[PDB]
Symmetry: D2
Subunit: 149 residues, 4 copies
Amino acid sequence: MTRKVAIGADHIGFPIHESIVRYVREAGEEFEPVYIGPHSLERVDYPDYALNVARMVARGEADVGILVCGSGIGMSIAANKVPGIRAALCFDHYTAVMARQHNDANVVCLGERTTGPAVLREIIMTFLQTPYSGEDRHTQRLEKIKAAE
Amino acid sequence: TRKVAIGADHIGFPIHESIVRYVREAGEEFEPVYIGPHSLERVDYPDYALNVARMVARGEADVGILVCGSGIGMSIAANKVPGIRAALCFDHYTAVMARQHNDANVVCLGERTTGPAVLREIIMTFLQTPYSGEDRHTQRLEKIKAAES
Amino acid sequence: TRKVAIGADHIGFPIHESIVRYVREAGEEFEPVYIGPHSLERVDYPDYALNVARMVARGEADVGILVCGSGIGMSIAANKVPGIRAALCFDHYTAVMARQHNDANVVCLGERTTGPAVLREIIMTFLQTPYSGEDRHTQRLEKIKAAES
Amino acid sequence: MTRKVAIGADHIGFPIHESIVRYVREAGEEFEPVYIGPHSLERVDYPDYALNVARMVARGEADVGILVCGSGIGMSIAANKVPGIRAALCFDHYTAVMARQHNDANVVCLGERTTGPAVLREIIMTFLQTPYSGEDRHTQRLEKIKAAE
């Protein structure tokens, strides 16, 4: 039953990584977070952490990914370059629901500079708890994304 | 002249004429090229995402705009194309930073989430905002490129 | 039965039928009462704000919904009425908290800012969410009441 | 030329008050902030600080007010109870512009739990720098709000 959630940031996300770890662990009994870095305020490059989490998720070393930078945008661009990854920029409850229900997203990308802590919590909770719809019309869309990889 | 390829799905279709008009309001140099769909028929967002994205990546167009319900499926699909940096934007800030930091070449928008005046703001801002030119973002962007091989 | 007085200006007018429908989707107990405007003619938001607000404050209606471009003018005008707690909401979270903490009796919405599925989410959430009942919010709310004299 | 900006919070806003003070002082040469409290994490009641700032602004002891709670909603409800106050809940650049340009808002209300720091900065900058439109159609709306006081 344990679902490991790999969490990655840059130095802009770094200052809130502890809260992200908690929001995961409190989202449900089976979710366990693994924070992969970085470990200081030293400037680093978001794609290195994006790609490390996305590759973990793609290989089945983690079930879900969470990435945090200033806006979430760079993380979502980088992570989507990994085959098998569907990385969703979410900024509210509605987008979190749709990312899962329609896109079966396996990575959620968030902006520390844009979205406040209770909303980041709610996004994470929602993303981890919402199932994929299972419907044919969505699946056919997802197969076209996988063909393009 | 900057050619702006515009794509939607059926969910974004009903507002596509307003999107074309927002592009022309961003300035006289912008030439919108709306590539479909041209009716209310249900279609698959990735066909239109990948179409706009491929155009921009091949240099058939300078910038892309993708409109679906939330923006997320468009951003996931577009980013599968090498050379593409597709940014889901939902406000002025994210539109600025997608350009300034990520040199984003495709903006992805949600017709179900984001109201018309904000969509207009985002499009104008996205088209008018330059890349900051800073080497630390450039190195990040080179890392994303390297992950595409 | 809960009567839901609904007001707009000319900017909110074009979506008022969707707002009425979102109210009926929130549950069978909700009865929408749309009080105008009934055409595209330019009107003054405060006339409709104060009208909905006065209805709710006098107990002619249980809840109010006000729609203008951004929500802001509606919230400023409605809150001038004693007994009114009008909340500008733009997502699920704010819709929850307006109810749970502020026991808000009027929700104010922006047709220009917020997309249709989020407006629907907000309305449903606002109508379905109860006040938390906590005494520390009640004391706050009594302080607002005291400032109205 | 000095424009004093009175800033008030509750204990939920308290942890970011320093950043708010800076965002004001850096918004323009003439703006100077005055933080009125609270001064700890001890729980307090948002209406007491809302009403103190709003009354400062209403009496001409400060030119503009800023209020910060979890969502901004309680602050905007309370502050609007003071005659001469037009208190706008803002959550992005667009709402900040409209609050000033259309509503001539003199108080801006913000949510620490909802909106991230770079957006809070941008809202403040925009709110302080944007003039009122001066137009008759807006002024007639504002006179109707003042009649209701």
